[PDB]
Amino acid sequence: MKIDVVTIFPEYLQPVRQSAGLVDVAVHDLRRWTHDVHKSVDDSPYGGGPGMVMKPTVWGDALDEICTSETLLVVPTPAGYPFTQETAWQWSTEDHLVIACGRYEGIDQRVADDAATRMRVREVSIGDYVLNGGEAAALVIIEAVLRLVPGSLLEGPSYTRPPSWRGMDVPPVLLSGDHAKIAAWRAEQSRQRTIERRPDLL
Amino acid sequence: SMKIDVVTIFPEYLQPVRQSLPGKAIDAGLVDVAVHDLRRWTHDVHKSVDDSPYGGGPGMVMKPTVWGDALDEICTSETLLVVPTPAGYPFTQETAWQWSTEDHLVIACGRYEGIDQRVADDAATRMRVREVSIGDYVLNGGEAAALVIIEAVLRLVPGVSLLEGPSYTRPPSWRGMDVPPVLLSGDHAKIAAWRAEQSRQRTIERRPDLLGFDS
Ligand SMILES: Nc1nc2ccccc2s1
Numbered sequence: 001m002k003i004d005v006v007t008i009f010p011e012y013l014q015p016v017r018q019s020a021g022l023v024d025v026a027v028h029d030l031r032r033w034t035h036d037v038h039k040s041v042d043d044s045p046y047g048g049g050p051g052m053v054m055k056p057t058v059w060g061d062a063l064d065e066i067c068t069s070e071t072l073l074v075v076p077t078p079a080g081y082p083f084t085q086e087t088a089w090q091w092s093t094e095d096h097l098v099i100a101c102g103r104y105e106g107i108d109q110r111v112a113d114d115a116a117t118r119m120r121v122r123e124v125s126i127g128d129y130v131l132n133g134g135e136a137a138a139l140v141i142i143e144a145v146l147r148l149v150p151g152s153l154l155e156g157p158s159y160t161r162p163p164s165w166r167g168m169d170v171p172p173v174l175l176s177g178d179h180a181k182i183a184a185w186r187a188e189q190s191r192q193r194t195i196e197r198r199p200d201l202l
Numbered sequence: 203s204m205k206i207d208v209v210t211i212f213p214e215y216l217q218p219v220r221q222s223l224p225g226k227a228i229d230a231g232l233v234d235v236a237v238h239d240l241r242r243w244t245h246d247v248h249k250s251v252d253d254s255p256y257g258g259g260p261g262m263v264m265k266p267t268v269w270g271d272a273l274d275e276i277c278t279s280e281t282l283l284v285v286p287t288p289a290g291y292p293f294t295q296e297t298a299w300q301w302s303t304e305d306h307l308v309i310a311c312g313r314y315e316g317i318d319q320r321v322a323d324d325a326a327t328r329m330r331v332r333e334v335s336i337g338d339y340v341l342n343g344g345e346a347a348a349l350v351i352i353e354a355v356l357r358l359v360p361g362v363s364l365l366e367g368p369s370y371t372r373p374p375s376w377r378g379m380d381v382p383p384v385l386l387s388g389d390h391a392k393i394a395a396w397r398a399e400q401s402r403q404r405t406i407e408r409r410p411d412l413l414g415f416d417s
Pocket residue numbers: 076077078102103104105124125126127128129130131132133134135137
């Protein structure tokens with residue numbers, strides 16, 4: 001798998017040089033494709049309003065150079081479809097991901113619209129909160145996808161040694177050698193924790 | 203000023219918190235971010251932080267002893283202890299607003315298959331503890347989730363619904379694609395109307411749950 005990340009903060013994605021030569025991850029400074037001596041990457045939004053919108057001419061040139069017809073173009077955005085584990089599984093078999101990191105106010109919509117006439121494009125949000133930029137979302141997506149590269153209910157509490165620590169004992173069932181019972185106990189712990197923390201999953 | 207301590211076995215990995223939005227916040231002195239190697243609180247020469255789970259199962263569990271010593275040194279009773287975990291309560295924008303008012307956040311990053319539950323149980327007897335998930339996907343470790351949390355929170359610190367619709371900037375025509383004319387009209391009310399519509403039409407397609415619909 002090849003992953004190209006485009007960002008105005010290239011140093012952000014250097015740590016995730018975490019291996020083993022199975023994937024290739026390359027980070028590109030978006031300013032490579034700017035046109036002016038000021039290296040401008042955004043401009044005031046049409047229709048008014050706060051913040052800036054990233055320039056289509058800059059992104060268009062960047063994607064033109066980096067993408068191919070086989071590319072899956074990932075665009076993290078707070079207005080995106082949800083990125084889920086199912087999404088990660090799907091993307092883990094792709095030959096080429098390109099992740100376009102932009103500010104939360106967005107990239108000119110015509111960039112994605114144009115790219116979508118030539119390649120597959122996925123606009124996705126990693127959660128119901130707002131980040132200033134796509135870089136952290138890129139990190140999350142890269143981690144979730146790459147750990148799947150062949151290279152329900154919540155999980156309940158986990159325990160390890162020692163059997164007693166600061167007045168708290170490991171649940172005796174876990175030491176019982178009754179593995180059918182252990183499974184049933186873990187199932188109940190999962191049900192209770194899911195009810196408490198994520199009733200939506202039920 | 204806010205203080206954020208992060209505890210991890212991959213301290214170098216938390217470097218992306220520099221020269222960025224959190225980088226700007228640090229440089230402006232609105233937050234102090236400190237990263238600590240969990241292995242600093244081990245005492246064996248192989249610096250073991252994990253062990254096989256009681257009761258069986260895949261992978262390893264982080265030992266409570268090392269974590270307990272680390273949190274003893276770093277936390278006070280006023281600390282908000284944040285533990286990223288896929289089994290956590292949802293971390294949302296409301297959570298971010300809430301934590302943006304905290305004096306002291308400590309983020310415990312776990313790896314392998316989780317941290318011995320007694321760490322959070324013990325901590326809860328002394329301080330407030332929040333186990334949270336940033337989304338329904340699996341990471342290898344809590345570090346990337348810590349970066350997400352730090353960014354979502356810090357942008358809300360003083361001094362630093364529905365989906366946003368599409369945005370456009372110059373030029374008005376590009377590759378034969380035109381900016382929606384209403385945005386070039388100067389009519390604030392028509393623009394407001396068009397955007398509200400776009401925002402609701404994008405919401406119903408990508409996130410019907412926000413509007414109280416299935417899927
Ligand atoms: N929840 C998310 N917020 C942002 C902000 C900017 C870019 C991407 C994303 S995903």
